[PDB]
Amino acid sequence: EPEVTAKVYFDAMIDSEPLGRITIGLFGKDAPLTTENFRQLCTGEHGFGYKDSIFHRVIPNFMIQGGDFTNFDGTGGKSIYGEKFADENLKVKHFVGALSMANAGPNTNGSQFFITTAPTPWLDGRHVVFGKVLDGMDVVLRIEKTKTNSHDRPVKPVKIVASGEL
Structure with missing residues (x-):
């Protein structure tokens, strides 16, 4: 387990139903x-970010994915550096409650990420694990049980009504 150097958070909601706060520790x-x-996308320092984005994809017993604040369907997103940035550490393995970057091959990190809710060894070595859920895991677990439809997208939007640095 690597070192937490900063903490950010997400306040989640599902149609008037407040779910609670997810506190994330980052491995700076x-x-x-x-x-x-990730940190600067949580604060919105650059004019864009996670506030008001949703978790477009939910796969129970595996993970929840968010971060696409441009297309809200999993095809968008962008970093604060530009379109994509390189993979930093690929030697850190996933574990329950880990925050990992989504991508479309090597060095294609944008803003999409997922939170694993189970062991996902088939992702190890291919996705940068940059943090973990310190508090609010129950919130993550509740989001994981939300009703999906086609493409595993929540029938009702799971929204991040607020995000920032703690």
Whole structure:
């Protein structure tokens, strides 16, 4: 388990139903570029970010995915550096409650990420794990049980009504 150097949070909601706060710890020493990108997307320092985005994809017993604040369907997103940035640390393995970058091959990190809710060894070595859920895991677990439809997208939007640095 790597070192937490910063903490961010997400306040989640599902149609008037407040779910609670997810507190995330970031591994600033092991993934400085990845953490800063995530951190600055949580605060919205650049004019865009996670506030008001949803978790477009939910796969129970596996993970929940969010971060696409441009197309809200999993095809968008962008980093604070530009369109994509390189993989930093690929030696850190996933574990329950880990925050990992989504991508479309090597060095294609944008803003999409997922939170694993189970062991996902088939992702190890291919996705940068840059943090973990410190508090609010129950919230994550509740989001995981939400009703999906086609493409595993929540029938009702799971929204991040607020995000920032703690």
